[PDB]
Ligand binder design. Sequence first.
Ligand SMILES: CC(C)CN(C[C@@H](O)[C@H](Cc1ccccc1)NC(=O)O[C@H]1CO[C@H]2OCC[C@H]21)S(=O)(=O)c1ccc(N)cc1
Lengths: 99, 99
Amino acid sequence: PQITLWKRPLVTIKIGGQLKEALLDTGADDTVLEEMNLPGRWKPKMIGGIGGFIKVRQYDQILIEICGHKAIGTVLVGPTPVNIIGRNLMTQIGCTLNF
Amino acid sequence: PQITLWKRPLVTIKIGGQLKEALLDTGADDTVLEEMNLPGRWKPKMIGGIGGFIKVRQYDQILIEICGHKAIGTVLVGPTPVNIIGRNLMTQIGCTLNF
Ligand SMILES: CC(C)CN(C[C@@H](O)[C@H](Cc1ccccc1)NC(=O)O[C@H]1CO[C@H]2OCC[C@H]21)S(=O)(=O)c1ccc(N)cc1
């Protein structure tokens, strides 16, 4: 599909057996989701943006389905105010910017 | 152009007569540029990102060229970690997400 940017590009995702709404975010290197209880190993990470940094948990090789498109890769989890799909997974579903 | 997302979608912009590099950021409602001198009247504003809130100078109706495409809109100036082009200007240049 084609998503215009009049409004926030929020799409439905499926991860860890849950459906959520998340932002298709070309400005995010890596996906970061709001706090959730994922199983498995993780590593601490710090990610920075406007206002400074937050601490997150980095999970590797996590399956996410994004508007019916499957993807598997790094998913960070932490106190983000919004679920963010980053470039690391957007490349896997075929997402480009066009103008 | 069609821009893939295996690298950061950085583009050359022109604002106030000066060339800069900026990030096309579909997760940003607004355009936020690093500290710079800009002609025009401005108002003090606050904007929030992943790490908290920052003070910015809001310049209205600013001419800005993005990768050869002209826009006229709001530009926020402050201590952002990177020059980001938000949806307020990406809509003006006809930018969409496609997969
Ligand atoms: C500033 C960018 C280079 C990086 N950010 C992605 C960006 O899209 C965030 C994503 C975002 C979106 C909402 C809330 C927090 C973060 N947007 C943002 O800060 O936009 C602000 C300017 O316009 C306003 O609209 C939204 C917030 C304001 S980030 O959220 O900090 C980020 C950084 C690293 C990763 N791996 C993932 C996300």
